Design a protein. Structure first.
Length: 129
């Protein structure tokens, strides 16, 4: 599913992401836009052989099991395919684990490079929330 901007903001809010560990909703929407262009089916392979899955591009080296990333962990305890669902619950629940891991949202390279230190509230302007 390809979300609309406000539709995704609402979904994320309902799933407890607004101000989760101090990151306002616009941060999460901004990261999703640049990670996946709001497409839950997004996948991208990394140089190390791991793959990133879903709306928030969660990596198989640490966070999910895809059956093809040798020596990897599955810290969210989920098949990576669950991250591709139109239902964002598994992505959100795993993202909450990731953002709590030490480095905050810096874990998402696109957040650091394209969202951090920008007016992220712009991503939710106009939405009914
Ligand atoms: Na893995």
């Amino acid at each position: 599913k390809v979300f609309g901007r406000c539709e995704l903001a609402a979904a994320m809010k309902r799933h407890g992401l607004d101000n989760y560990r101090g990151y306002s909703l616009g941060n999460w929407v901004c990261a999703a836009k640049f990670e996946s262009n709001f497409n839950t089916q997004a996948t991208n392979r990394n140089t190390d052989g791991s793959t990133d899955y879903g709306i928030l591009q969660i990596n198989s080296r640490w966070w999910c099991n895809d059956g093809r990333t040798p020596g990897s962990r599955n810290l969210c305890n989920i098949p990576c395919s669950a991250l591709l669902s139109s239902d964002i619950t598994a992505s959100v629940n795993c993202a909450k684990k990731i953002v709590s891991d030490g480095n905050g949202m810096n874990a998402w390279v696109a957040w650091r490079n394209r969202c951090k230190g920008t007016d992220v509230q712009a991503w939710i302007r106009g939405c009914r929330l």
